[PDB]
Amino acid sequence: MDAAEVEFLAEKELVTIIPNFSLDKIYLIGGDLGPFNPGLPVEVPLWLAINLKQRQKCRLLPPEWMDVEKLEKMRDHERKEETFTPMPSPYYMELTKLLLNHASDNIPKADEIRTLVKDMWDTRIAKLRVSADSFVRQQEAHAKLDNLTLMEINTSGTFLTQALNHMYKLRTNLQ
């Protein structure tokens, strides 16, 4: 799995748009969507929202958590904690990337939001490094990690699992 596929799953996440056009509810294989009404909030998959925004047929609304004040508190929280803290969304990195790239005009303080989220990612990947060192040094064989995101797990998880596989062989070569 590559990062493009992680984003592919993120695109399924629902977001709220403000249509500037009218249209009867559509019947997609994954579920009904709409109806659509000018000026009325609608729930649609991220990939559809992105496309409609590009097509300039709607306004993108930012997630309640995509706020400089809240993100600023989350970043400080993540730094104070030795473990991983609960992230706003299971696809916070993908939603920031896609929304800021296609609707920064609809997101206030987009510049700052980008820095705060980039910081959270930096602090969490670094923490993952320190966490893995502890896991390896104590030669652990199992771990719970409810707070990690898929993008994070996929980005450095092949390294950790490859290392664990080798250690397993080395730990059992005299058996």
């Binding site: 592919f8 064989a141 199992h142 719970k144 409810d146």
Partner: protein, 196 residues
């Protein structure tokens, strides 16, 4: 039974296949239903049109990726894929659709023939037969993986290594995420209690 659920099942197989170190069970009923849905929708074919075709592409992509992943595994362990199917007890789920089986057979014949005509037949009388079941690596089930618990499971034994003294029990809670050896939770992947 619904289309939405059909798609969820597919993505589940797609993800599980991507991370499992071995070839997983064939899901013919899923592939077919997805092919049908695409065919039907394709025929039904204004903005609503562009929206439908976009979704069709998303689904087509997952199917193709899933099927592509299965072929590489079939190719990687081809002798073991054929031997396992050969001794598969009646009733147990096959790791091969009728079509994938044909593909695997052909891969074997083609490679064995190529190997025979190019070098083996030109070797001494006592060194012309190479056991492919031994020459080709089997899947390594002692590979670590990450999973998402879909259904609560209890009394799961974690085996750090070959020293029974380090063994301990664990419980997997719904929604939680874990890191552990694949061999320990393989049956859970098959039953769908867990997701890789």
């Amino acid at each position: 039974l619904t289309p939405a659920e059909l798609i969820e099942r597919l993505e589940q197989a797609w993800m599980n296949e991507k991370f499992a170190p071995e070839l997983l069970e064939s899901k013919p009923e899923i592939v077919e239903c997805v092919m049908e849905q695409l065919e039907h929708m394709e025929e039904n074919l204004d903005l609503k049109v562009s929206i439908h075709q976009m979704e069709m592409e998303r689904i087509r992509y997952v199917l193709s990726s899933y099927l592509r992943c299965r072929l590489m595994k079939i190719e990687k362990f081809f002798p073991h894929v054929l031997e396992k199917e050969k001794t598969r007890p009646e009733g147990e789920p096959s790791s091969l659709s009728p079509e994938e089986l044909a593909f695997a057979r052909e891969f074997m014949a083609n490679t064995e023939s190529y190997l025979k005509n190019v070098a083996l037949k030109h070797m001494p009388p006592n060194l012309q037969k190479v056991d492919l079941f031994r020459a080709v690596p089997k899947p390594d089930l002692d590979s670590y993986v990450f999973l998402r618990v879909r259904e609560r499971q209890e009394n799961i034994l974690v085996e750090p290594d070959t020293d029974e003294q380090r063994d301990y029990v664990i419980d997997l809670e719904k929604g939680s995420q874990h890191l552990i050896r694949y061999k320990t939770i393989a049956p859970l992947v098959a039953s769908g209690a867990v997701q890789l």
